[PDB]
Amino acid sequence: MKGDVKIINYLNKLLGNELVAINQYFLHARMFKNWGLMRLNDVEYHESIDEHKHADKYIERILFLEGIPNLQDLGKLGIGEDVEEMLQSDLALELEGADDLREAIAYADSVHDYVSRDMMIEILADEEGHIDWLETELDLIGKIGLQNYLQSQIKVKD
Amino acid sequence: MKGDVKIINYLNKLLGNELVAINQYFLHARMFKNWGLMRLNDVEYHESIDEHKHADKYIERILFLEGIPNLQDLGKLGIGEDVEEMLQSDLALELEGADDLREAIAYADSVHDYVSRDMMIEILADEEGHIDWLETELDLIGKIGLQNYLQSQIKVKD
Amino acid sequence: MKGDVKIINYLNKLLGNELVAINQYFLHARMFKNWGLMRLNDVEYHESIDEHKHADKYIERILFLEGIPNLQDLGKLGIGEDVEEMLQSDLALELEGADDLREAIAYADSVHDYVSRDMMIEILADEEGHIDWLETELDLIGKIGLQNYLQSQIKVKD
Amino acid sequence: MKGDVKIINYLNKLLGNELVAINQYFLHARMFKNWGLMRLNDVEYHESIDEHKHADKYIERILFLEGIPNLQDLGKLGIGEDVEEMLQSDLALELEGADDLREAIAYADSVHDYVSRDMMIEILADEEGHIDWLETELDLIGKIGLQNYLQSQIKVKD
Amino acid sequence: MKGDVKIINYLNKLLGNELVAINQYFLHARMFKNWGLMRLNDVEYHESIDEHKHADKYIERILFLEGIPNLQDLGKLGIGEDVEEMLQSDLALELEGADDLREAIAYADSVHDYVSRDMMIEILADEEGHIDWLETELDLIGKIGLQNYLQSQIKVKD
Amino acid sequence: MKGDVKIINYLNKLLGNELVAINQYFLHARMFKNWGLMRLNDVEYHESIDEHKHADKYIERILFLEGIPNLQDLGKLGIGEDVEEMLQSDLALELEGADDLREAIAYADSVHDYVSRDMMIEILADEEGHIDWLETELDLIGKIGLQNYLQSQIKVKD
Amino acid sequence: MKGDVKIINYLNKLLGNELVAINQYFLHARMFKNWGLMRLNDVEYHESIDEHKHADKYIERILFLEGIPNLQDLGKLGIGEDVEEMLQSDLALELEGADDLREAIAYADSVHDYVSRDMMIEILADEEGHIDWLETELDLIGKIGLQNYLQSQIKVKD
């Protein structure tokens, strides 16, 4: 089904956001694992998987609309050297991406691509869930102190 | 544990090959899926997952050796426009990657990093499996013709 | 709960669309069955049941909003005589209905009937799923040939 | 228990036919597998195992008759280069073996070795089973054409 | 995948060794069975199957490397004439086979065929396991005497 | 099977390394247990059992190669008086043993004892896992402080 | 809880006895295994594990009493070359250890360390069980002959 040209541009821009986040969450997780912080490895690894599902949704939607998914252009990763800096970098990316989503969701409504809009609103709800988790972990670091914070990321999560 | 510097560079080279293969296999699968070729979607997607496991092994090895994994630089994808071109692109990529593995395996032996070598030999055996499958599929297109070959990619695989 | 008058007219229009698609998919299914193409019988019969579920939603929403559902006026069916015309007739009908849906969804937003809008977006997502299946089948006929295509519709689908 | 001298010669000849068939069927199976024809791999491999069961009966019978089984002299294999050539080679080998069995069965009756005869008649019934299968596969190639025939050897039989 | 020409020659030599050992172990097992030594029949028959697995590995690797497996030339069998002679012949054949493996494995590393090397090293480990069993049985004959040794081969093994 | 003289000397040296580790990890474990650090008792004891498994492989390999295992000469233990010192002593011993393994793996290749080499490469990957665990614990002491670190060694690990 | 100084010396002496018996029984077990005498491997390996449990008791009791367990000094092993010498070496070692135990038990009673005494009496009962097994086996060699004795150690024990 032939889709709106600018829609496919937005969808590719959003896909680009997800591709960065996949790699960044993935490296961050294995850095936590290498440091022995297995609880952070598990949550960050799962958020890597979650952005991969978002990428999948964007890719399949673009192909349906008869556009060309762009997996070639990788934006800038922000890795960071300790726990606080990694979580902060993930949080910066997530907000940047939420800002892009809000713009695409508004445009999708103006051209009546309501199914693309609905897909994006659901993805936006997922990313605001990641944002909530990231802000909460960062606040905990301040409240309980870095040594206590790291201590309780050693063993794994239910 | 401090690793050999040139070992870390090879590991990052081989990591970069897998990062390209993850994305190429991922897009190829969903193109197959969009065309209704569910058997090809299943196999190509599973090889994307399998290249992700290879990348995970490089990443974790690089960190253990106290190097820095490079997930930022993404090499050139070769997407291709129809089934035969896509399969041939994947094959070209797999042959380039086996070439790098053989050089890396030879070097790792010279500096006595026998665990990095054992890891890479296992990965090379996997990749020769992928090569075997691609060569076999490409030969079958010729043996039974494109229409028959595509027909039997419609329904899924056991 | 009294609803917007123009909303009830849009709902009845959309209901009219589903009523023709129920009948068209039903007859097409049994034509496929009569020809021994049981995989097409199964899929088309199932889409007939789906359009019946959509019609149910319209009927119940119209009665809730204290309007009168119109099941009397039946639009123009396009039956066709062979597989490729039957699928293309079904594709034309779905694109026309997606057109009407996009107009009703935009109007529902302007008079603040957000529940009717939400129900129509979910129906529009279903119809875009039907459109994808129809386009994909029609393309496979061109990719594998009509004789191969008909052959792989003989036996039934998982 | 002392066997008739010429009976042991006949058993060793028949044993030699089975040894050629084991190797020929074995290589043919793995050529089919290499080509992706998993159905042909499965059938030809089982027939290789069937001929091993026949060799086992000859070897055990020869030893019981206090002869010396000959597993040293291997006759001429006829491998063949494509599917039709390979099946025609197996058919020729099977018809040659049936010819030897009939002569041995007639002779066993004349010296009252009725147990060796009964064993050979069962084996001959097996080999006429293999001949039936090969003749049917060769005829199918003619009826449905080589491309369709190879296509339906891709996925596995039940 | 085009393999190294001298690799394929080594693979066919090693395959030749396995084909001799398949037959020798097979016949030896059934001679033990004929003598009522059921425990030796069981082990020797199992070792015949194991050498068949190794032959299968060589055949499939050669075809992958686009060579021609040689199942035609069968080297000399050394049957032997009582229990200890048969075991010594198996041992002599295994030591000859392990000698050839050592040379192929070294050559494979020089031409960077690391997967063929890995396969042969795993086969060599199996062969050193057979050698250990053979050496152990030979030593037992000398410690407990042939009458006691044969007695404990009558009933079967867990 | 007559083994290379030096190979047996390398294997007895590596066996010597394992025998000191068995005793050091054994004593360290029960010292942790006496201090109520049950998580560290659990892990260290397990590593003592793991080195005993390594010792077992060296002993069986040396006897198979017709050497004589030396279990008499016990090298210098480095017990240590507090947790950080004990872990650093284990780390030092593991790095010394890995150094010896690398020399022996190089030598074993030069004389074509590929099965001994394969065994020692597997052991070496196990010891690099032990090294990884030791380095991570020692870094965690730095990052969360000794008091917190000891605290989360009190209760046992999943 | 601070213990009697001479009690800790007795405990370390007794611990030294168990440390040599662990190694001697271990090597003897695998020598039996290398020779194919699996029933003797099983029994001797199990006694090695038993002496390891005794050593554990000594180590934990010494640490409880605030002494320093000595795992560094390893007494003189007597390995031997054949079954009857290996068993007789094991018997001499056990009788020497029973001697030391009897002395330590009498001393523990005089300084009122009744818990250390009770633990040593239970260990002494175990060692008298080992002595009984060794004397009984050695006597069977004389009653049934060495060739019969070795024969009935080939297969494993219930």
Under an 8 A CB cutoff, do B118 and F102 touch? no
Distance CA A42, CA D127 (A): 60
Interchain CB contact of E135 with F (< 8 Å): yes
A22 phi and psi, to 5 degrees? Answer: -55, -55
Strands annotated E in E9-114: none
Distance CA E100, CA A155 (A): 51
Cβ count near E155 (within 10 Å): 11
Q: What is the DSSP letter of B72?
A: S
User: C125-145 in b/e burial notation, b at 16+ Cβ within 10 A?
Assistant: eebbebbbbbbebbebeebbb
Candidates F33, F24, F38; CA nearest to F158 is F38
Of G30, G60, G74, the CB nearest to F74: G74
Distances F29 to A89, D115, E90 between C-alpha atoms, Å = 41, 71, 48
Find all residues with CB under 8 Å of B53, minimum gap 6, and list them: none
Distance CA A69, CA A59 (A): 6
> Please, how many CA atoms are within 13 Å of residue G122, restricted to the half-sphere of its CB?
10
Mutating which of F44, F57, F73, F74 best tests the G interface, going by the most G Cβ atoms within 10 A? F74
Would you state the structure tokens that stand for residue F87, as one six-digit string? 């872990």
Distance CA G40, CA G42 (A): 5
Candidates B73, B88, C142, D153; CA nearest to A75 is B73
Interchain CB contact of B115 with C (< 8 Å): no
Which partners does chain C have (≥3 C-beta pairs < 8 Å)? Answer: A, B
Distance CA A114, CA A110 (A): 9
B87 CA to chain E: closest CA distance, Å? 15
Find all residues with CB under 8 Å of G37, minimum gap 6, and list them: G83, G150, G153, G154
Distance CA A31, CA B144 (A): 49
Convert chain C into a string of H (helix), E (strand) and C (coil): CCCCHHHHHHHHHHHHHHHHHHHHHHHHHHHHHHCCCHHHHHHHHHHHHHHHHHHHHHHHHHHHCCCCCCCCCCCCCCCCCCHHHHHHHHHHHHHHHHHHHHHHHHHHHHCCCHHHHHHHHHHHHHHHHHHHHHHHHHHHHHHHCHHHHHHCCCCCCC
Distance CA D46, CA D67 (A): 29
Under an 8 A CB cutoff, do F144 and A151 touch? yes
Would you state the structure tokens that stand for residue A113, as one six-digit string? 């691509």
Cβ atoms D27, E52 nearer than 8 A: no
Interchain CB contact of F59 with G (< 8 Å): yes
Cβ count near D122 (within 10 Å): 11
Token look-up 């290249």 returns B51
Of G26, G71, G76, the CB nearest to F26: G71
Under an 8 A CB cutoff, do B60 and A23 touch? no
Candidates B77, B103, B102, B107; CA nearest to B90 is B77
Candidates D111, D122, D131, D114; CA nearest to D57 is D122
A67 phi and psi, to 5 degrees? Answer: -110, -175
Distance CA G89, CA G34 (A): 19
Rounded (5°) CA angle D31-D34-D36: 115
Residue numbers preceding breaks in chain A (C to N > 2.5 A): none
Rounded (5°) CA angle E106-E108-E114: 115
Q: Is B36 buried (19+), middle (13-18) or exposed (0-12) by CB count in 10 A?
A: buried
In total, chain D counts a number of residues equal to 158
Mutating which of E128, E132, E136, E138 best tests the F interface, going by the most F Cβ atoms within 10 A? E128
Distance CA G88, CA F61 (A): 26
Candidates B53, B139, B52; CA nearest to E1 is B139
Rounded (5°) CA angle E60-E65-E69: 55
Interchain CB contact of D76 with E (< 8 Å): yes
Candidates D100, D81, D82, D84; CA nearest to D20 is D100
Distance CA D27, CA D35 (A): 12
For residue B117, which amino acid is it? R
Cβ count near G4 (within 10 Å): 18
Distance CA E62, CA E54 (A): 12
Longest dimension (CA), chain A: 55
Token look-up 């597998």 returns D33
Distance CA A88, CA A136 (A): 11
Cβ count near C71 (within 10 Å): 12
Of E64, E114, E118, the CB nearest to B102: E114
Q: What is the DSSP letter of F70?
A: -
Convert C85-119 into a string of H (helix), E (strand) and C (coil): HHHHHHHHHHHHHHHHHHHHHHHHHHCCCHHHHHH
Candidates A80, D60, G49, C48; CA nearest to E26 is D60
| DSSP-based three-state secondary structure for D13 | helix
For residue E42, which amino acid is it? D
| DSSP-based three-state secondary structure for B79 | coil
Rounded (5°) CA angle A108-A14-A1: 50
Contacts of C149 in chain B (CB under 8 A): 151
Interchain CB contact of C110 with B (< 8 Å): no
For residue D104, which amino acid is it? A
Rounded (5°) CA angle G57-G61-G62: 115
Distance CA B127, CA B132 (A): 9
Distance CA D73, CA D69 (A): 11
Cβ count near F13 (within 10 Å): 17
Cβ count near E100 (within 10 Å): 16
Distance CA C133, CA C140 (A): 11
Candidates C136, C123, C56; CA nearest to C91 is C136
Contacts of E112 in chain B (CB under 8 A): 102, 105-106
> Please, how many CA atoms are within 13 Å of residue C128, restricted to the half-sphere of its CB?
22
Alpha helices by DSSP H, listed for D35-74, are: 38-64
Candidates B81, B80, B58, B78; CA nearest to B69 is B58
Distance CA A100, CA A96 (A): 7
Cβ atoms D12, D67 nearer than 8 A: yes
Instruction: Identify the sign of the CA torsion E104, E110, E113, E114.
Output: positive
Token look-up 């560290």 returns F40
| DSSP-based three-state secondary structure for E96 | helix
Candidates E22, E36, E50; CA nearest to E153 is E36
Under an 8 A CB cutoff, do E115 and B128 touch? yes
Distance CA A11, CA B132 (A): 36
Helix axes E114-144, E83-110, angle to 10 degrees: 160
Q: Is G80 buried (19+), middle (13-18) or exposed (0-12) by CB count in 10 A?
A: middle
What does R_g of chain B's alpha carbons equal in angstroms? 17
Cβ count near C46 (within 10 Å): 12
Would you state the structure tokens that stand for residue E64, as one six-digit string? 């992958």
Distances C117 to A114, C9, C104, C125 between C-alpha atoms, Å = 10, 14, 8, 12
Candidates B124, B121, B111, B99; CA nearest to B6 is B111
Would you state the structure tokens that stand for residue G121, as one six-digit string? 């009496």
Cβ atoms A19, A52 nearer than 8 A: no
C24 phi and psi, to 5 degrees? Answer: -65, -45
Resolution (A): 2.0
